[PDB]
Design a protein around this ligand. Structure first.
Ligand SMILES: *[C@@H]1O[C@H](CO)[C@@H](O[C@@H]2O[C@H](CO)[C@@H](O[C@@H]3O[C@H](CO)[C@@H](O)[C@H](O)[C@@H]3O)[C@H](O)[C@H]2NC(C)=O)[C@H](O)[C@H]1NC(C)=O
Ligand SMILES: *[C@@H]1O[C@H](CO)[C@@H](O[C@@H]2O[C@H](CO)[C@@H](O[C@@H]3O[C@H](CO)[C@@H](O)[C@H](O)[C@@H]3O)[C@H](O)[C@H]2NC(C)=O)[C@H](O)[C@H]1NC(C)=O
Ligand SMILES: *[C@@H]1O[C@H](CO)[C@@H](O[C@@H]2O[C@H](CO)[C@@H](O[C@@H]3O[C@H](CO)[C@@H](O)[C@H](O)[C@@H]3O)[C@H](O)[C@H]2NC(C)=O)[C@H](O)[C@H]1NC(C)=O
Ligand SMILES: *[C@@H]1O[C@H](CO)[C@@H](O[C@@H]2O[C@H](CO)[C@@H](O)[C@H](O)[C@H]2NC(C)=O)[C@H](O)[C@H]1NC(C)=O
Ligand SMILES: *[C@@H]1O[C@H](CO)[C@@H](O[C@@H]2O[C@H](CO)[C@@H](O)[C@H](O)[C@H]2NC(C)=O)[C@H](O)[C@H]1NC(C)=O
Ligand SMILES: *[C@@H]1O[C@H](CO)[C@@H](O[C@@H]2O[C@H](CO)[C@@H](O)[C@H](O)[C@H]2NC(C)=O)[C@H](O)[C@H]1NC(C)=O
Ligand SMILES: *[C@@H]1O[C@H](CO)[C@@H](O[C@@H]2O[C@H](CO)[C@@H](O)[C@H](O)[C@H]2NC(C)=O)[C@H](O)[C@H]1NC(C)=O
Ligand SMILES: *[C@@H]1O[C@H](CO)[C@@H](O[C@@H]2O[C@H](CO)[C@@H](O)[C@H](O)[C@H]2NC(C)=O)[C@H](O)[C@H]1NC(C)=O
Ligand SMILES: *[C@@H]1O[C@H](CO)[C@@H](O[C@@H]2O[C@H](CO)[C@@H](O)[C@H](O)[C@H]2NC(C)=O)[C@H](O)[C@H]1NC(C)=O
Ligand SMILES: *[C@@H]1O[C@H](CO)[C@@H](O)[C@H](O)[C@H]1NC(C)=O
Ligand SMILES: *[C@@H]1O[C@H](CO)[C@@H](O)[C@H](O)[C@H]1NC(C)=O
Ligand SMILES: *[C@@H]1O[C@H](CO)[C@@H](O)[C@H](O)[C@H]1NC(C)=O
Ligand SMILES: *[C@@H]1O[C@H](CO)[C@@H](O)[C@H](O)[C@H]1NC(C)=O
Ligand SMILES: *[C@@H]1O[C@H](CO)[C@@H](O)[C@H](O)[C@H]1NC(C)=O
Ligand SMILES: *[C@@H]1O[C@H](CO)[C@@H](O)[C@H](O)[C@H]1NC(C)=O
Lengths: 172, 318, 172, 318, 172, 318
């Protein structure tokens, strides 16, 4: 939520998206369509999996310890044992809480950053043939086919072929 | 139309999950996972650990040789399970520093007993009692020797025993506290007893305390239990002039992974690496909220079972 | 300080601003003015209050403990008690330090991010009728009234009405 | 003019506050709040806790029944306050494991004493002393019974007491250490004493140590104080043949929230939920730097006098 | 890696850069060249040094402690001492791990943010005389000398002198 | 050409360094620094600390006055170094609570001994032994006094000693455990001994235990060592009727920075502020992986030998 992409200038999500996490949706002169982008989804999935499998691997193995349940009242030694146990439990619960609280924030912020990165890349591709309409979509001022949007999707859009037509369409 | 449009967006789910963050306390994401495991199966699997079921016997009674624990001779355990229905049916006894001996024998993992030939000249061996019947007649513990006067005298017993092996030896002995001042002189002609057990670096001297006690199984006398550890190259000397419960040998002392646990759960033939007093619990999660007493590769005990970690983006539905 | 908005391309603050935390200041053809924006200020205040009231709620309640001040010298038990107390104090002071050190950084970065979000929204509103002058202000190339700036402030600016005039003013 | 301008910015304050960050050690923000609380009012409020002011008496002297602590009979406390001006004005005594008994009685919260009818036949009861005057004549502790020989003999005491109730009972007894070998045989005809107190699961036997001590209030003899706990269904047996300070009854043992605190601060009629040896402190802040000894819902003791948390943006003035 | 500048839209690093951490490299009508920018490098170095010298200053000084190596087997006191030591070691190793894990991430993200800040400043300087080519370079649509690039480097570029020439060059 | 180009970028290095992050476990940066330090020089520098080399003597033998530790009289140390080649060559002895006394004297930092004039009338002073030869004749410890019967009697000793100074005094005394019941009555005419040492607030009474022990240097008797602390304004009283190893004075007790360390490393004339049992280690790094026993301003002991912090950007080579 630091970049303002998810829950920011993109109003809602797409519940019909089942291929990946991030994707496109175009409205053309031949109809409508929809697709996904594998790279951003893969980056997010790899980062989240790395984090998850980072935290959950084990570190402790204890065999013999002290007594923690007593049937009598004795004195100093029992008091010290109970104090030690209470201190250990209270000091580990705080770590358990803080780790989750920090990692959830970092996960949310990185999954928000990936969307902004994809948006900025798509903006940088359409050099001066498109205008940002403010709600997550680009208005492309020249006429594409279903093969023009796919060149924008797999990163080989050639902007200089449609430059003169777009400039005469948008500025006059 | 001579233009086009290209919109970008992300996915959402109808029901998401509420998680806590640094800023918010309840934020809805598309997916979350739990790290605390708070369920148990109810049974204790006997693989791949070696579990020993102490049905009606404790560890100390199986050590001393109670007549109803004679099936536990040379038991080798990886985890001893102690039940609450356990009781004693022999001579009433007492152990100073009971927890120390219980934890010393529990973590050793063996009840292997090597018998040794002690020479007690001038006394009568193999004393018995009517509170510890082994069969149809009187009996006693199977690892101890109750010596009394031989005819009309009780000489000063002084035995040696050297340790020439390459392991430690554990000796268990005791002292007899009589009930009256008449039964003292009828078993040991001396009016006061004393037991000294010494190595080259330590010594223990105990003196019997004549007095009356509550009746337990028909007796008001008592026995106090002590132990000694002899290291390789050392020597053991026993000196006494009455009130001696002599040993018959030594237990072999080992070091490894072994412990003891009080639990009333049955034992099945499943496979699990963690054991709690409630039964075996899986160990796929890093945390657990079942019991703080655990054996094996167990997750850590936390106070909170609601710990949800987010594994997805934020959930913004239509 | 990660986005470069506060103490970045905005030189200084406005000490005459007493309504909110973030606001506007326009220079028009009818005079000057000033106002505030409630939404960004509210988001920042809610986040900071949530964090604050998150950390300060209590967790401990202790009634009987061990002795921590002695009048004699005794031996092993007193040494173990003093060691336990020293370990507990040293382990809690580190947490006290690290929590504050992390949360101050996160607060600063989020209060810096809100400004960049407001700036980017205002830039996205003025589609092609404005140019960014590099120091936090926009040069609007058509002529507004005191009612044109307020349409930009409450999020209902209509860019297509002034498009032709602005394009002829800025590009020729 | 045919153009316009629209500038964006944030607010600043003339004096801001310096805080620490992950990168910088001193960064100036518009606002900050303190985590520690390092002040006290100086008085101990008596609401909503029940405070008892032990003006000139300790807990043990108010337990035994010192003649200048007879106002503390059946005192029920929620927090006992012990002053430093306290002293003893009765028979000089001694308690082995003093801290254990002090913490056992402090956390119980009651001095409720139920008197019981013991039968001591063959001895003289209600012994007195000139160091413990209760009024114009000699006296003793009000919860103990000093038994001596009756005419020319001192038989072997052997009393019993069963526990048929559903709570635990605390018995306080003692043993008398004389000064010379002549006053031993003039109070208890036997040349050596012994006291045995036994339940079904424990036993304590003590023997007096004849010798000389420093003069305290005119005496060189001493008294040693011991205690026993009887659980429901158990039984108590007392055996002796001299040097016995018998009990008169039992204290009722409870479990709850109660403690003790050494402090020389006065008591007022305010309202506060936290109490430190310096007085009551408010608990609006999570941390405190006043005292590490606390009672109630108190903030945690830190070593800093300053930890500041930022609640605003960065401060960039004109 | 949150801003996508380093290892993002900048393909690789410059191993021939030995003056500073961030710098420029221009291709002109008189040849090629290279230089550095002191301010971004200085900001990054100061932040990283402050962090480093923040963590490594000492806090502990212990003289008398408890026994931690025993030659016998005794009982309760030895068990409690070993438990205390094991708890202390296990609780300090976790802090040692988490501090490094957090600070490395923050260092990487701040050194990534400085590059994006420099890029955005350079973009804001060339108001409408340049176009971003998408791989980290700007195409400047008027003709500069070796003295024009240096005015862009020391922050005194005057955009309005070359405005008409650039606008006629890029749009027609 | 009528255009130009201006590219931006960052630097890279050919070999970078792998570090761990929150997301990745191995990410390559341009530079990294180590947190741990795990090498030692091998020698113990004697600056600016004051190191004392206990070549063939322990602390307790240098306290009592062993004849081969007479060079350690009034040694003032800042850190005592104990070697493993140490041994004892005097009367065989024993200390109950040995670690307590060792840590009490180690942290005091002085062996300063003020001799006092005690008056023992009716006994013979300066007892000797053939196991503790100081020169060509028999001897004993130099800080203790072995009293035996004078001709045909051994009266009841009863000495006093007041403390009028403004510091604490440490007294070291002992008791003699004989071997047979014939050598008891030939040194102290009484058939049983007893030693009482008392202050105004404490008391210690010990009784000798006649018996046989293993032969050590030609003797089967023993000595047990006890100590007393007298605070300013207090008083010390010693009462006895046999088996007393009297003191000759008191040690001065201080408080400061001093300790003890077992190590077999030589001592050189370098300069270092940290000392480990392996030798001196520098303290430029915050962490260390050499030893968990440390003296001075030492880094903390971690388990990881490798722990790298990034001080540069990411490394993306050509
Ligand atoms: C009770 O039994 C113990 C154990 O045997 C007796 O202790 C033993 O005492 C003899 C004394 O002659 C020791 O022999 C001596 O050994 C040393 C060392 O080699 C040697 O220098 C002497 O000349 C002598 O030969 C023997 O080692 C010792 N055994 C041990 C290990 O304790 C004890 O004396 C017996 N008590 C009696 C006499 O009732
Ligand atoms: C001094 O007081 C003690 C404690 O009361 C007396 O001990 C008691 O001795 C009698 C002897 O018969 C014990 O009786 C036994 O009780 C059990 C339980 O019902 C019963 O099964 C036996 O057949 C027998 O009747 C009694 O238990 C025992 N006290 C306790 C509480 O166990 C002692 O006798 C008194 N002094 C003397 C020696 O007279
Ligand atoms: C063995 O030595 C001790 C130590 O002096 C002797 O104990 C002392 O006995 C006298 C008897 O009068 C005590 O005197 C009392 O002193 C107090 C304090 O001034 C005074 O108020 C009394 O009126 C009386 O004079 C003296 O206090 C006591 N020692 C101490 C230090 O308290 C003991 O008498 C000697 N052995 C014997 C019995 O000869
Ligand atoms: C990227 O997408 C474009 C979509 O346009 C692919 O290109 C077309 O490729 C087919 C196959 O030969 C041709 O018949 C069309 O004429 C192409 N159209 C255009 C506009 O180029 C292209 O092959 C894709 N490249 C990759 C690597 O996936
Ligand atoms: C595992 O067993 C323990 C011990 O039997 C259970 O703990 C007890 O739970 C009951 C019911 O909540 C409490 O009344 C007791 O006070 C608990 N005893 C303790 C805490 O010592 C525990 O609930 C069991 N857990 C599961 C998952 O079955
Ligand atoms: C948003 O601000 C604009 C400022 O222009 C408000 O609009 C004007 O509304 C008044 C009231 O009827 C009219 O007389 C003006 O002609 C309007 N001017 C323009 C340029 O539209 C508008 O009402 C505000 N909307 C909200 C929801 O606050
Ligand atoms: C609360 O009371 C305690 C104990 O009286 C005060 O602590 C002492 O402070 C003085 C002066 O700084 C020191 O000389 C003592 O050594 C302290 N005693 C300790 C630490 O046990 C404490 O300062 C008081 N706090 C307030 C806020 O009044
Ligand atoms: C910033 O860089 C510019 C590079 O152009 C410096 O300017 C030139 O300064 C020289 C020295 O007098 C003149 O001869 C040139 O005509 C200038 N060229 C231009 C295009 O201005 C300028 O001095 C530098 N300023 C600072 C503060 O470093
Ligand atoms: C410092 O000295 C200690 C103790 O001599 C060394 O620790 C031992 O290392 C050996 C070899 O790895 C192990 O077999 C022992 O079990 C260790 N003893 C312990 C841990 O108590 C340590 O390696 C030395 N360190 C350096 C850097 O020389
Ligand atoms: C949520 O994540 C878990 C594993 O973390 C996965 O098994 C599950 O399928 C995910 N939920 C959805 C709806 O994909
Ligand atoms: C236990 O093991 C020892 C050594 O193997 C053996 O001597 C002894 O006989 C065994 N016990 C039984 C019950 O046979
Ligand atoms: C700073 O914050 C506190 C509460 O956190 C608030 O009471 C105070 O008014 C704030 N300061 C200013 C100048 O608003
Ligand atoms: C204390 O309480 C008990 C039980 O209520 C009562 O028997 C006893 O008399 C009370 N004490 C006084 C001083 O009356
Ligand atoms: C890496 O950093 C260290 C100090 O942190 C410095 O001494 C070293 O020169 C740096 N490496 C390079 C290649 O500059
Ligand atoms: C040790 O110091 C004391 C006090 O200064 C002194 O009386 C004594 O003689 C010194 N010891 C030696 C060996 O002289």
């Amino acid at each position: 939520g630091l970049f303002g992409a998810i829950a920011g200038f993109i109003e809602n999500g797409w519940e019909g998206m089942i291929d990946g996490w991030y994707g496109f949706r175009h409205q053309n002169s031949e109809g409508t369509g929809q697709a996904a982008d594998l790279k951003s989804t893969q980056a997010a999935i790899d980062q989240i999996n790395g984090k998850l499998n980072r935290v959950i691997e084990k570190t402790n193995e204890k065999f013999h310890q002290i007594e923690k349940e007593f049937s009598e009242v004795e004195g100093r030694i029992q008091d010290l044992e109970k104090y030690v146990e209470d201190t250990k439990i209270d000091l580990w619960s705080y770590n358990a809480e803080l780790l989750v609280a920090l990692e959830n924030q970092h996960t949310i912020d990185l999954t928000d950053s990936e969307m902004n990165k994809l948006f900025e890349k798509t903006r940088r591709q359409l050099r001066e043939n498109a205008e940002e309409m403010g709600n997550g979509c680009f208005k492309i001022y020249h006429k594409c086919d279903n093969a023009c949007i796919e060149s924008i999707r797999n990163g080989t859009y050639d902007h200089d072929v449609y430059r003169d037509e777009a400039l005469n369409n948008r500025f006059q | 139309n001579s233009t086009a449009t290209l919109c970008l967006g992300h996915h959402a789910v109808p029901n998401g999950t509420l998680v806590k963050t640094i800023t918010d306390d309840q934020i809805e994401v598309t997916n979350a996972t739990e790290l605390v495991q708070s369920s148990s199966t109810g049974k204790i699997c006997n693989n791949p650990h070696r579990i020993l079921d102490g049905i009606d016997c404790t560890l100390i009674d199986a050590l001393l040789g109670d007549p109803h624990c004679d099936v536990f001779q040379n038991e080798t355990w990886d985890l001893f399970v102690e039940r609450s229905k356990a009781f004693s049916n022999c001579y009433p006894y007492d152990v100073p520093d009971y927890a120390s001996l219980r934890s010393l024998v529990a973590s050793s993992g063996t009840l292997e007993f090597i018998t040794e030939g002690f020479t007690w000249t001038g006394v009568t061996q193999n004393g018995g009692s009517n509170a510890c019947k082994r069969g149809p007649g009187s009996g006693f513990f199977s690892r101890l020797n109750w010596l009394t006067k031989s005819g009309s005298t009780y000489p000063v017993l002084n035995v040696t025993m050297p340790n020439n092996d390459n392991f430690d030896k554990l000796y268990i002995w005791g002292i007899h506290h009589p009930s009256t001042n008449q039964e003292q002189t009828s078993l040991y002609v001396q009016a006061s007893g004393r037991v000294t057990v010494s190595t080259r670096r330590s010594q223990q001297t105990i003196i019997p305390n004549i007095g009356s006690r509550p009746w337990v199984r028909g007796l008001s006398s008592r026995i106090s239990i002590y132990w000694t550890i002899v290291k390789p190259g050392d020597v053991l000397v026993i000196n006494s002039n009455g009130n001696l419960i002599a040993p018959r040998g030594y237990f072999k002392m080992r070091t490894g992974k072994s412990s003891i646990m009080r639990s009333d759960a049955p034992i099945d033939t499943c496979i699990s690496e963690c054991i709690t007093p409630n039964g075996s619990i899986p160990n796929d999660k890093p945390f657990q909220n079942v019991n703080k007493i655990t054996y094996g590769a167990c997750p850590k005990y936390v106070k909170q079972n609601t710990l949800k970690l987010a594994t997805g983006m934020r959930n913004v539905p239509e």
